Design a protein around this nucleic acid. Structure first.
Ligand SMILES: Cc1cc2nc3c(=O)[nH]c(=O)nc-3n(C[C@H](O)[C@H](O)[C@H](O)COP(=O)(O)OP(=O)(O)OC[C@H]3O[C@@H](n4cnc5c(N)ncnc54)[C@H](O)[C@@H]3O)c2cc1C
Ligand SMILES: O=c1nc2n(C[C@H](O)[C@H](O)[C@H](O)CO)c3cc(O)ccc3cc-2c(=O)[nH]1
Length: 519
DNA sequence: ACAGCGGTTGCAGGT
DNA sequence: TACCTGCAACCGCTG
């Protein structure tokens, strides 16, 4: 009987050559938890153990760099995320395969060599993803590969929101809420089960030439300019995502009473959750986070509501996802159905100054430096610098600010970055352009001593709180006494806010009329 | 039809 | 304190 059982597994070792492959394709959805596309594959494999190999893949795609600027800090985040993801898949008797190449070229090969029966992935609405996925579905159809996609990057499916709103994406938040209240949310899933009867798949032609061909990229492979790395304040991956979420949810009174407008842009520690990079890469399920918040809200029936509550912030994400789904030119002014056409000026020197936090406005400069160094800044810090760049002071296109954020943010999100840049430039969604953030006054409310400025603009760290926000008010002798002379150790302010913002408000009114008269 | 309402997160000067 | 008004007056939705 022991002899018999031995004969059985020896024979099955030949049978293994006859297996087809089930592929889950990670792009976002970079997590095991609440991942229906992944769970699909793992359930299919375990429902028929012996029949399939499982290949969880991430395609490290050179085409991304034709579309997106990616700074060193975000490359490091991705490196860490893929490593965490392989660690978690290992626990399930699997692993991550990181296939280098463009999807259009990779998929023809692997469909054939792995004998792929089914491919799953989490859907996405970005133009890159739309064109990519269309090409892959086309190829899978031709090649007879079953493709099942799942919508789980968002709580609501943009397509279904647009359908329920009679074919149009809602363009106001309250209307969006009224629509999504009528939609059901799928069940939030746990991590998939361990794979049964899953020997490692046989090496393909690539693996045969280099056994490490699909192994997780190193820092050296992914970060080509490590001199641009800052402190690793927000480590990548689902494990860190979940730890951070549980920590952020620990104070249920803080959660229950959360109002975004009352959180500081310049607290030295984040005043909000900093779950955004995790949500952006899919290291954290938005649907799980929402579920967790809802549990807390049950226990704390006295709680804040949208727009300002924590659930409210998730809904903003959903909101911008839906409007972005409907408009591939979401990230440009021209041809963007939502966007006010505003004659922004080009000014290379001012853009450079803003980009590198050398505007001569300490608050603005502090924020831009934190962003560059750390890759996260608070929402209202983003407001301050985005308003400054666009309608507030420099009159430079929101698209140029978008580009800088796109490089520097760990949470860089096509829809969210574009949506909020339009908001802040009063190009779309927000239209009360008479409200202009003051680069001098805005930060004072939450940091009267200027601690944040003293940290990120250390050259000004000896200035009295009375002029650290407005160092040009200090005489030359006082500047010398504070160890920082304007024009020498810190730049002269590149524009005068008190003049230019009034001029820009007039320009905004004139642009608005032109746009009105087109309709 | 177009007035009235509400709109995540303005500032300054004031109660 | 947490809130108010004046400042000029925008948008989309609603009826
Ligand atoms: C000009 C500008 C550019 C921005 N670019 C991005 C970006 O590329 N990627 C990005 O994730 N956020 C972006 N934001 C939105 C917002 O600032 C960040 O989501 C937020 O600061 C992240 O911090 P948090 O996770 O601690 O937010 P929390 O306040 O803790 O909110 C929780 C989650 O809700 C979502 N959320 C919060 N605020 C917004 C918002 N305003 N719009 C949409 N979703 C929101 C995020 O996923 C966030 O993680 C931008 C904002 C501005 C003003
Ligand atoms: O499929 C990929 N997605 C990558 N993405 C994820 C990307 O957001 C999704 O592929 C989107 O679906 C593209 O529209 C990255 C995102 C970043 O912010 C930075 C780098 C990458 C790199 C890749 C990549 O190599 N392959």
């Amino acid at each position: 009987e022991k002899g018999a059982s031995t004969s059985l597994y020896k024979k099955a070792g030949l049978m293994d050559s006859q297996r087809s492959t089930l592929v889950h394709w990670f792009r976002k959805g970079l997590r095991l938890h609440d991942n229906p596309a992944l769970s699909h594959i793992f359930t299919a494999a375990n429902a028929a153990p012996g029949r399939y190999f499982v290949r969880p893949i991430f395609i490290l795609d050179p085409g991304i760099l034709d579309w997106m600027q990616v700074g060193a800090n975000r490359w490091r985040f991705l490196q860490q995320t893929l490593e965490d993801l392989d660690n978690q898949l290992r626990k399930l008797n699997s692993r991550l395969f990181v296939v280098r190449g463009k999807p259009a070229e990779v998929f023809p090969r692997i469909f054939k060599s792995w004998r792929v029966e089914m491919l799953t992935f989490e859907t996405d609405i970005e133009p890159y993803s739309v064109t990519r996925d269309a090409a892959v579905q086309k190829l899978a159809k031709a090649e007879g590969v079953r493709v099942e996609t799942h919508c789980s990057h968002t709580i609501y499916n943009p397509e279904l929101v647009i359908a329920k709103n009679l074919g149009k994406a809602p363009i106001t938040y309250q209307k969006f809420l009224g629509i999504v209240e009528q939609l059901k949310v799928p069940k939030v899933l746990g991590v998939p089960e361990k794979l049964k009867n899953m020997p490692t798949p046989p090496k393909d032609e690539v693996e045969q030439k280099d056994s490490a061909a699909y192994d997780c990229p190193t820092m050296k492979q992914l970060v080509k300019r490590p001199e641009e790395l800052g402190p690793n304040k927000f480590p990548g991956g689902e494990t860190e995502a979940l730890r951070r979420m549980e920590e952020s949810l620990k104070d249920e009174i803080w959660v229950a009473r959360f109002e975004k407008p009352n959180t500081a842009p310049n607290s030295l520690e984040p005043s909000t959750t900093v779950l955004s990079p995790y949500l952006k890469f899919g290291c954290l399920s938005a649907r799980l986070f929402n579920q967790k918040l809802k549990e807390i809200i049950k226990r704390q029936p006295k709680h804040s509501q949208p727009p300002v509550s924590l659930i409210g912030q998730l809904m903003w994400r959903e909101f911008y996802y839906t409007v972005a789904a409907a408009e591939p030119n979401f990230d440009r002014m021209l041809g963007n159905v939502y966007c006010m056409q505003i004659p922004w000026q080009e000014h290379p020197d001012h853009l450079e100054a803003w980009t590198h936090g050398r505007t001569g406005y300490p608050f603005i400069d502090a924020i831009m430096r934190q962003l560059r160094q750390e890759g996260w800044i608070h929402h209202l810090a983003r407001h301050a610098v985005a308003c400054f760049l666009t309608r507030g002071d420099l009159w430079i296109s929101w698209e140029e600010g978008q580009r800088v954020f796109e490089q520097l943010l760990l949470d860089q999100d096509w829809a969210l970055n574009a949506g909020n840049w339009m908001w802040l430039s009063a190009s779309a969604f927000f239209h009360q352009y008479f409200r202009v953030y003051s680069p001098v006054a805005f930060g004072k409310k939450t940091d009267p001593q200027g601690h944040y400025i003293r940290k990120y603009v250390p050259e000004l760290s000896k200035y009295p709180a009375g002029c650290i926000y407005e160092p040009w008010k200090a005489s030359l002798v006082d500047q010398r006494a504070y160890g920082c002379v304007l024009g020498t150790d810190y730049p002269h302010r590149i524009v005068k806010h008190e003049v230019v913002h009034k001029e820009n408000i007039k320009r905004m009114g004139a642009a608005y009329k032109v746009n009105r008269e087109v309709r």
